[PDB]
Structures are given as C-alpha cells and as structure tokens.
Amino acid sequence: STIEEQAKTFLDKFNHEAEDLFYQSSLASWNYNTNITEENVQNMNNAGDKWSAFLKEQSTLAQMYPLQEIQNLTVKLQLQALQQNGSSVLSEDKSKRLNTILNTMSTIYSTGKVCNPDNPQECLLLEPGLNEIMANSLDYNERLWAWESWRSEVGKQLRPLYEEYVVLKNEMARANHYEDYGDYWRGDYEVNGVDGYDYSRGQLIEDVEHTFEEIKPLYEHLHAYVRAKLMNAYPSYISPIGCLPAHLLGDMWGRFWTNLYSLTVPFGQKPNIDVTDAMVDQAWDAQRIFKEAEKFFVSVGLPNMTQGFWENSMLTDPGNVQKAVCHPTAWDLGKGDFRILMCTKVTMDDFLTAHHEMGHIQYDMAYAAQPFLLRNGANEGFHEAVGEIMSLSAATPKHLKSIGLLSPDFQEDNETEINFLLKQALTIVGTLPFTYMLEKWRWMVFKGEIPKDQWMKKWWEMKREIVGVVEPVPHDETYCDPASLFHVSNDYSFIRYYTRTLYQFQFQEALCQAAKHEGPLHKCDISNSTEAGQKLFNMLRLGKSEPWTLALENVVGAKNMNVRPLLNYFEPLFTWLKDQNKNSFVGWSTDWSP
Amino acid sequence: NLCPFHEVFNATTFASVYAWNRKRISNCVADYSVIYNFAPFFAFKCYGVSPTKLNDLCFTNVYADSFVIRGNEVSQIAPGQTGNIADYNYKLPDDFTGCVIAWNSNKLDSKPSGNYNYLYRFLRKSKLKPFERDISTEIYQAGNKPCNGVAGPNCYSPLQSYGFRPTYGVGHQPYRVVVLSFELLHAPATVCGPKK
Ligand SMILES: *[C@@H]1O[C@H](CO)[C@@H](O)[C@H](O)[C@H]1NC(C)=O
Ligand SMILES: *[C@@H]1O[C@H](CO)[C@@H](O)[C@H](O)[C@H]1NC(C)=O
Ligand SMILES: *[C@@H]1O[C@H](CO)[C@@H](O)[C@H](O)[C@H]1NC(C)=O
Ligand SMILES: *[C@@H]1O[C@H](CO)[C@@H](O)[C@H](O)[C@H]1NC(C)=O
C-alpha cells in the first residue's frame, strides 16, 4: 500500500466519523437555538467538546502522511485541511492565554454598556439602544457623543488585550510555516498544484488593490453625491472641499450606508417600491412565503427541497412560551438534514432574506455528494454570493408582477430604476472601500513592517485616503478604534465581504447572459431559465473540490475578481450621478484640517 | 402450504447489511399477493421476470435476503452496480432473475439517540462476489505495518455504523430491503403458482 492509498483510507474513515459527530453537534446547536435552556447549553458543550476532541486526534494522525508524496488533488485538499496545526503549535500557557484573551475581548464587546451622560442609571445596549440612536439621528452633537463615547471607553479596554493578541496570533502563524496572521488568513484564497488555475497569497493583495483601483471612480461619484445630499440636512458641519465625518454614516462604524437613504433619496415625490401592504392583505404567511421561494427555485431549475425541511424548520417564532434566537440562518446538519431557522414576518425584507437563506440551502444541497472536508464554498465568499444572486433576482418588479404582489397598473420608469440602483449602491458599493481599508490595515499590522506606536495614526491616515472618512476629533494612541468592530474583536476574516460583492455581480452577469435577457442588468430575472439554473448548478455542485479559480470560470468564464460586472450593473446609476453632480466637486481634499 | 412470505416482510428486526439474512423458501404455493400488501414500496425492480407474470412459473428455490441500508444505497442493489454495498456488503449477480423490494422504515428502525445496531463494511482486501457474506470482523491493516491485534495509527477496524436518526433525509433514512432471487436449477421445482 502506498502513502496516497493510506491517505485515502484514513480520509474515508475520518469522513464517516466526522459526519456522524458533526450531525450530533449541529443537532445539539439547533436544539439550543430553537430552545434556550440550561440542558441545551450543556448538550452543546458536550457535543462541541466531543467534536473538537475528535478533530484534534484526527489532525494529529493526519500529520503522518506528507503532502509532498501525494499526487491526487482531492486527497491533497482534504489532508491539507485536516493537517492544519491551528493553535496547537503554541505552548500550553500561550494557548490558554490566547483563548482567555479572545474570550475577554468577545465578552467586553458583547456586554459593553457605556454610561457617560448624566448618572449611570441610563445606559443603552447594542441591539435596541445604540443601534436605534445611531441609525436614525439628526443631532450632530448626539452622534458625536455616542461615537466618541463608544470609541473611548471600549477601545481603551481592547487595546492592551489587542496588542498581545496580535503578538500571540503572529507567533502562531509563524509557527504554522506562514509569514504572519494576515498570510494565515489569505491562505484561503490560495491554489497550489493546478496548472493554469493557481493563486498566490500575495496575488490576492495585488488583485484586491487592482479591483479597488477600478472601482474607485464610481465610489468617488457616490461619495460626492452623499456629501452633497448630507449638506442640505447638516449645515455648517461638513466642508465643501473636505472629506466625510465618520459618525454620520448611519452605522456605528460606517460599514454600511443603507441607513443613509432618507437624506439621499433623489425623487422624494416618487414613492419607493414596497409590497408589504399587498403581501399582508393577500393573507400570506411564512409557509406561503417559503412555498413561493421554492417555486421560484424550481422555475429556475434547481431541485425541490425535502419533506423533512418543511416539518423540521422553524419558520415562525413560537411565541414567548419558549425563547429562541431567530437570526435567519440556513442549517446543513449533515446527513441529509437541511433546516432554516428564522422568525418570518410578512415583509419585503423577510421575503428577500427567505430567498437568500433558501439559496444558501440550495448551495448546501448541491455539494451534498462531496466529501465532508470539501463540503463548503470554493472560497468564503461563494456562499454569500450565491445567496445574494437569488436575493437580487427575486426583488425585481418583473418577478413581483409575475408572482402577484405587484399590480400590473404599476409602471417602471427611469426614476424608479434610479431609486432602486441608488439603494443598491448604498448597501453594496459603500461597503467595499471600508472592507478593503480594514483588511489592508489588519494585514499591515500583522506583517509587522509598520511600527506599533502609530496604529491609530496609520488607521486614520488610511481612512482619509481609502474610504474618505475623517476623524471628527483627534485620537491619541490609547484608542483601539478598529477593535470596536465585531469582526476585529472576535477574530474574523473581513475580506469575504469584499470578495463576495464582486462574485455575486459576476455570477448575475453570467447567468443573465445565459438566460438570453436583453436590457439593463438590474432588471434581470433568472426565473424560468433552466439554462441559467444548469449553469449555476455546475458551479454549485463542485463545492471545495475544484479550485475557486476553476469554479469561477465554470460559471462566469473569468479567472479572478472582475469589476466590470459591477460597473455595468451600476452603469445607469453611474451615468445619472455623472450628469447630476457635475456642478459639485468630486473627491476629497488632502489639506483638510480641523 | 404457505411458507413464511409474510414473516420475512413483517419481521420485528431486520439484519445488518454486512451480515444479511437469507431464507430458503421451498415446497410452497406462490401467493405473491401477500408481498403486495405493503403499499409504500420505495422500489419494486423486477430484473429478468415480469412484475405481473410471477404467478405462472415454478422455481426450485426462492431466496428472500432482507437487510437495512440507506436511501441512496438502494440503487446499488441491482445487477452491475458499484459502491460500498455492492462490493463489500451485498453483491448480486449480473444475471439475477429476481425482484428487489425496498421500503422506508424510518419508524420501525431509527432512533433519536442513534441506532448504531445497523452496521456495514467499508474496508476489505478484495471486492465481494455475487451472494457472498463476510461476517468476520478482523481489523483491516491499512499498509506496511502489521497491527498484531488491536487498532492504531494505520490499522482500521472495518465495520462502520449507520446511526439512523429519524431526522435524517430521505436518502439517509433506513430502508428495509427484501430481495427475491428465483433459482431455476434443473431439478423438480417445489414452488409453484396456484391455478385452477
Ligand atoms: C423547550 O424547553 C422547555 C423548557 O422547559 C421544555 O418544555 C422542553 O425542553 C422544550 N420544549 C419544546 C416544546 O421544545
Ligand atoms: C483522486 O481520487 C479520487 C477517488 O475517488 C478520484 O475520483 C480522482 O479522479 C483522483 N484524482 C485524480 C486527479 O486522479
Ligand atoms: C417540489 O416541486 C415539485 C415540482 O417539480 C413537486 O412535484 C413536488 O411535489 C414538490 N415537493 C415538495 C416537498 O414541495
Ligand atoms: C414563469 O412561467 C410561468 C408559467 O408560464 C408563469 O406563470 C410565471 O409568471 C413565470 N414567471 C416569471 C418570473 O416569468
């Protein structure tokens, strides 16, 4: 028996045992998320301990077979995923210190309650209070107070922990035969062994930078329009030539500009599209919503869902008798069990997110034939891109008219298309510069080529030039403003939101080209297109077996991130912006001084 | 005389696929209509014999192999198939004049705690042959180093379990499969169909 045959046998035994234990762990987690008790917490703890203890032993018995003696590619990928040392390279004391640091950071971010104003009796929490007062606020002083109060009390707590967390993560990454933790993270968009379809962990940086350079003019036009619209509401608070203050971007950290729509809608007289009224008047429930979504998927060509999905998914909150978190998530519990957990209201947003999680489920069933370690997207943006394709398609007025929520009396015009494209750009384009900024900063920090005594200095100077958001007040080095973000504090990769944004529009362009759709791309409908369904399914069924380069080419025809689908998607909006903001300055000055 | 056609289909427990149960049926009236009592039959393939002309021929013996597999492994119970059931657990010949009957048993079998009593074999030195049974549980060494007993780094005990929870998908649910194989040896046939 050769080393590769030994690897095959080991990987098969693994796949089986891992599938069993993963089903047990996922079922325990689903029981908890549908029923928050103490017995359910204990069940998750036991199942997760068993799963992690199995994964450690299987990794330490996978280290035996070297990769250099393996000629197969699927076996190579499975053993590469299984042999990952992870945090085991660190000593016991260092590993426990890192775990304690991560837990303390997560608890500080989650339980953070700030109480500067008046007596500490009045304090707000993340979800209802701080988000409610940051999303919809017209008070510059109040917004500044909230932003600087959260950035001061919290960041000062994370920074002493964050520096040592960075040191420990960099040490672990170096011990893992990498260059830094940034390289460890970039090792996900890496292909080695395939000729013609290969990727490098620095090639990702080059590609991301080139794509952002391509996207930049559209972002500058959108930024100028946003500043011009914000000026009318906010007098004497934003300069005509300078950048945009960070605390007035709707979100807590300015990740999304979606909430900045009431102050930026061009055609206020023209009503926006919304089908909530007709949806609730036509006696529509969660069952009907999901039945319509599965009808759309069947019309596209994808297979229907199991009868167990309907009887096991919890689509509505079961009242206050039992408490259950209803964050919309699609569950792939393993052995043929697909469930969706969400609190479905009769709303356009809930309909769209039902389509999104249903696309996630379709992706999960597509690669159900792949081995356990290859049951994932080609990279970490493919799943969200696949879901967002169907979210984009199901929101079109043509599809709404076809299904029945939109009356035929309604007409489509350039004003409506501009409103829809502006909302889409605020949601989608406005997050790409921020994501690229954050991941560039984190990569530079982990690489260590920059010094440590100017973390916030470099963070702010990169905010000025990349995203165009300025510091409302000066910040010293005791702050840790990047750590205030959930992904930064909880040790999460953030380039996935950059990559998925390009991938989803590439997929939409390819599928609409294969659906013989004529006209603008934003008015497309993948529905009733078995050709588009088959083309998407070809990439869907691959999973992680084929390299993401080949998976992208199998459905699109390109080999990397392309900005052209995004640009020709937003071409009508871009042309309208160019026509409209010609009398106002475009861009941000570098000479601004508070 | 009516031999246990009902007892094979209506049995409290069904054997594992790796060690399946074979019953030799002889000296009978045919009474194939007892088989058709069960409505939810997931598969009624009838390779080599008409599914309506069974009650006209005579065979020396009839074998009713009964076992439990997954839903996506039912397709491997057919002449010429390949997988893990068709070459390590239960292979049936290329000719195979007979019928394959399978129906879902997610209620009788399966258990929320995990029904690990139903096992299958996933490792063998050589592929199985038509109608062969491998009950031995000797550990299948992966390569280049004898285990001299117990399992280890590249040892690997061969039998693998199903688990069969009731929340599994349709292709991962238990399926009681009863395979009828008619034997036509050049001997006085003992099983015949009724006729006036
Ligand atoms: C949910 O938890 C409650 C808490 O006592 C208990 O009835 C049972 O464990 C679960 N019930 C249901 C209906 O899920
Ligand atoms: C790797 O092994 C699998 C075994 O199922 C096989 O299907 C595949 O073709 C092999 N890869 C190559 C490149 O031969
Ligand atoms: C799924 O859709 C198909 C349409 O091709 C239909 O025949 C089938 O009954 C549906 N099944 C479920 C469970 O919705
Ligand atoms: C898809 O085709 C069906 C049948 O012709 C039709 O009822 C439905 O409105 C179509 N949907 C779309 C979005 O074109």
Numbering used by the authors:
A (entry chain A): 19 to 612
B (entry chain B): 334 to 529
Article sentences:
Since late 2022, XBB* variants, especially XBB.1.5 and other XBB derivatives with a proline on residue 486 (486P) on the receptor-binding domain (RBD) of the virus Spike glycoprotein (S) started to dominate, which demonstrated enhanced binding to human ACE2 while maintaining extremely strong capability of evading humoral immunity. Interestingly, L455 and F456 are two adjacent residues on the receptor-binding motif (RBM) of SARS-CoV-2 RBD, and the variant is just the “flipping” of the two residues, L455-F456 to F455-L456, also known as the “FLip” mutant. These two sites are also located on a critical epitope that targeted by the public IGHV3-53/3-66 Class 1 NAbs. L455F caused strong affinity reduction on XBB.1.5, but significantly improved the hACE2-binding affinity of XBB.1.5+F456L. Both L455 and F456 are on the core of the RBD-hACE2 interface, forming a compact conformation with D30 and K31 on ACE2.
As we expected, all three spike trimers mainly showed two ‘RBD-open’ and one ‘RBD-closed’ conformations with one or two ACE2 bound. To further reveal the impacts of mutations of residues 455 and 456 on the interface, we determined the high-resolution structures of these three variants’ RBD in complex with ACE2 at resolution of 3.3 Å, 3.0 Å, and 3.0 Å, respectively. In the case of “FLip” (L455F+F456L), the F455 manifests a distinct side-chain orientation and conformation compared to L455. This unique pattern confers more flexible space for Q493 on RBD and the H34 on ACE2, hence enabling insertion of H34 side chain between RBD Q493 and S494, which cannot be realized in XBB.1.5 or XBB.1.5+F456L, due to potential clash between L455 and Q493 in this conformation. Consequently, two additional hydrogen bonds, H34-Q493 (3.57 Å) and H34-S494 (2.57 Å), are introduced, enhancing the affinity of “FLip” RBD to ACE2. Further analysis concludes that F456L is a prerequisite for the fitness of “FLip”. Our structural analyses reveal that “FLip” mediates substantial conformation change on the RBD-hACE2 binding interface, which involves the remodeling of not only 455/456, but also Q493 on RBD and H34 on hACE2. The superimposition of three RBDs onto the structure of mAb Omi-42 in complex with Beta RBD reveals a slight reduction in the hydrophobic patch of XBB.1.5+F456L, while Y110 of Omi-42 CDR-H3 cannot be accessible to engage in hydrophobic interaction in “FLip” RBD, resulting in a weaker interaction, consistent with the previous conclusion.
